[PDB]
Amino acid sequence: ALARRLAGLSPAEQEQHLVDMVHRHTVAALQAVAPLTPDQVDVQRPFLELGFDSLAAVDLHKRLTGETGLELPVTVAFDFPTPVLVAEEIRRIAF
Amino acid sequence: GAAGATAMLFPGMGPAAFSDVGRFMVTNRYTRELLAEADDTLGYSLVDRFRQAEGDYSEYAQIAFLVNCVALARWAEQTMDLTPRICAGACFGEKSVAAYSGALTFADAVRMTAGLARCMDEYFRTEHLGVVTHSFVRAPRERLDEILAELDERGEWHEISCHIDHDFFMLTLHERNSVWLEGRLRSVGAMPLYAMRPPMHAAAFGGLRDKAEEEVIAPLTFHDPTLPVVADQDGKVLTTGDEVRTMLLESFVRPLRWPDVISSLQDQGVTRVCVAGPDSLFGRVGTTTRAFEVIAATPRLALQPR
Ligand SMILES: *CC(=O)NCCNC(=O)CCNC(=O)[C@H](O)C(C)(C)COP(*)(=O)O
């Protein structure tokens, strides 16, 4: 289903799109911890640095499993510690 | 959010190191206010004997946790003009709600929290050696029951010690299962979180409950709480010093059912909860965050300048 919406875009536009989505859910997951965090966030900074705990990591994994409809490991936020790397990993799965 | 009553929740004791709460305990005035009442009750310097203590769940770590949660419970009320209509505590939280609800004088609560801490210390030296509580999340009820079935079939003594959420349980059993269990949890695609040892938050200590009643809970004197208290075991709403007394003893033989507490607080028309103390679970987990607008009165939040 994902591969559909991706095909047609440059590799870099697919980067942009995925990084954008993984960002959307990273701020969403980060709002549950301390709503004090802004609406946007530096996608190159590791999650735990931004203020993830174990339960946010598992929260992100639901949201991403949700939208992507893919087999992501529960520990995806730990194994790929920056939004960019989660988007990197998501692409590799979809193809 | 604001469309109903506010509840004051007290969290279960996490692995608290003086390192994490130190500056707050000596800075915050509510803590200093209680620490002085506590030092008087105990006849030693709690902060100094906490600071230089070993471990995560020390005798003095336990007292300190009560001081901090209760202090933060008050701090939150005054600073954020909260007026709770009902309070609740999970496991150790019971000791905190006891003091807060007025059900016990704060000095009695200290005497109690100390007495139990010491009864357990002495208990786990001989009883339940090598037993371990395993926290884990993304283990749906269907997938746990597969693993519990294998333990039944293997004939391995085991106890769900806390129900946290639909897919989040603490499981207490012998450590000879630890590697085995983590193996199966990852198979179903759940994530192991923590191995408690000795298994303090487990609820299979009939032996302890009797000795705790004789030496600690009996000499104490329990007044009716100034507001309803919800019970971790079943979610029942208590209103009598006696019911509180029971709530505390029951926790040696009756596991935490956090869903029931939420379900019950919801029935009591709650929309807002203030989780008072160093928490990272009872304030954060879905069971709470799906149902209520959370206010984590962490020591971090208390030290935040404005
Ligand atoms: C009342 C009661 O049962 N209290 C004890 C509940 N807690 C434990 O058994 C400790 C479990 N701790 C964890 O599972 C994790 O360390 C946390 C607290 C969920 C945080 O995980 P991550 O953010 O490091």
Ligand SMILES: [Mg+2]
């Ligand atoms: Mg209990």
